[PDB]
Amino acid sequence: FGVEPYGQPKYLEIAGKRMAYIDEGKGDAIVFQHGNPTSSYLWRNIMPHLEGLGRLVACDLIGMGASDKLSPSGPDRYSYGEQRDFLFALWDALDLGDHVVLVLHDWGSALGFDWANQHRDRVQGIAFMEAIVTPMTWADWPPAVRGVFQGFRSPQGEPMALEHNIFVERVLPGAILRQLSDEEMNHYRRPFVNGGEDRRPTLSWPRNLPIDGEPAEVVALVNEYRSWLEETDMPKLFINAEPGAIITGRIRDYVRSWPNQTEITVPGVHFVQEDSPEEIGAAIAQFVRRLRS
Ligand SMILES: [Br-]
Numbered sequence: 001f002g003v004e005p006y007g008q009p010k011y012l013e014i015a016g017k018r019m020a021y022i023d024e025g026k027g028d029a030i031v032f033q034h035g036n037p038t039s040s041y042l043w044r045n046i047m048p049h050l051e052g053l054g055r056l057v058a059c060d061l062i063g064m065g066a067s068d069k070l071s072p073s074g075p076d077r078y079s080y081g082e083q084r085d086f087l088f089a090l091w092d093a094l095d096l097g098d099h100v101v102l103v104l105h106d107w108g109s110a111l112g113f114d115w116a117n118q119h120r121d122r123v124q125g126i127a128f129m130e131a132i133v134t135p136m137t138w139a140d141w142p143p144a145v146r147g148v149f150q151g152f153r154s155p156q157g158e159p160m161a162l163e164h165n166i167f168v169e170r171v172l173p174g175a176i177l178r179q180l181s182d183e184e185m186n187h188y189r190r191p192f193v194n195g196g197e198d199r200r201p202t203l204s205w206p207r208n209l210p211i212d213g214e215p216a217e218v219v220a221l222v223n224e225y226r227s228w229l230e231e232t233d234m235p236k237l238f239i240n241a242e243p244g245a246i247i248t249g250r251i252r253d254y255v256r257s258w259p260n261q262t263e264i265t266v267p268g269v270h271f272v273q274e275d276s277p278e279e280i281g282a283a284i285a286q287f288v289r290r291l292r293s
Contacts, residue, residue, distance in 0.1 A: 003184055003187070006044040006056075019086065029055050030057070032046070032104075033087075033103070033104050033111060034061070040060050040065055045277035049278075049284065054101070061201065063201035070200075073198075077204065081217075083107070101124050102123060104126065109130075112126065117225045120234070132246070140251055141246070142248075149206055152207065153206060161203035165192055167203070173185070176269065176274045236262070239280055
């Protein structure tokens with residue numbers, strides 16, 4: 001498990017904010033998108049497997065990784081919709097072309113599925129793991145973290161995230177099978193070392209999860225993109241995790257009904273990149289070679 005980032009950050013000003021990304025290599029774009037509470041760093045041991053298969057791009061969501069913080073920050077900031085406005089504008093600016101393979105996790109999957117559904121002609125394939133693929137109930141959510149996520153989705157969320165940094169310090173390591181090295185953990189901590197609003201994105205994200213019908217706008221979004229994913233003949237790569245976290249049980253059965261789909265299974269809970277990067281990397285490379293072939 002390599003500890004260094006895959007590339008050095010590059011920056012573009014988007015809508016009044018500097019956003020950070022990795023962009024290495026040439027050819028058709030392979031775009032990796034992290035979710036909460038991670039950054040492009042999550043992909044550092046996976047991207048090498050895609051060398052020579054395209055232009056490898058991994059963006060840091062607004063407020064996350066090396067991307068700027070929104071200001072003034074507060075409970076109305078970093079909604080799905082605002083994260084989308086910033087990321088979609090970044091992807092537009094980067095001139096990704098029209099043969100994009102998306103490699104998606106967590107909220108990166110909601111964003112990337114939405115983007116593909118809105119740019120169907122530009123997407124060649126989607127690989128996804130531990131993704132948001134359908135509206136949920138708490139029974140779908142890992143038992144071990146129900147209480148913590150209900151707390152985030154309440155007024156207790158502010159002290160949990162902004163004061164105590166619980167998403168970074170507890171949720172992240174609790175959903176990795178191995179133990180991160182201190183150096184790896186401190187790469188995850190970096191964007192969030194300051195108590196207070198720097199940690200807002202880690203709180204806004206759980207508040208957007210589509211659970212028991214709320215928030216309704218996100219439930220609506222997921223229902224729209226999932227209807228496309230059911231029907232589309234776009235090639236898919238489903239990277240299932242064991243035991244997994246958010247794609248388990250009935251949700252896993254549901255994903256397995258999608259057409260034109262390759263499956264792999266690798267060990268992991270939620271942050272599967274930190275347990276099985278070689279296997280994930282190999283599988284994405286085989287998928288992309290097939291799509292080029
Ligand atoms: Br979340």
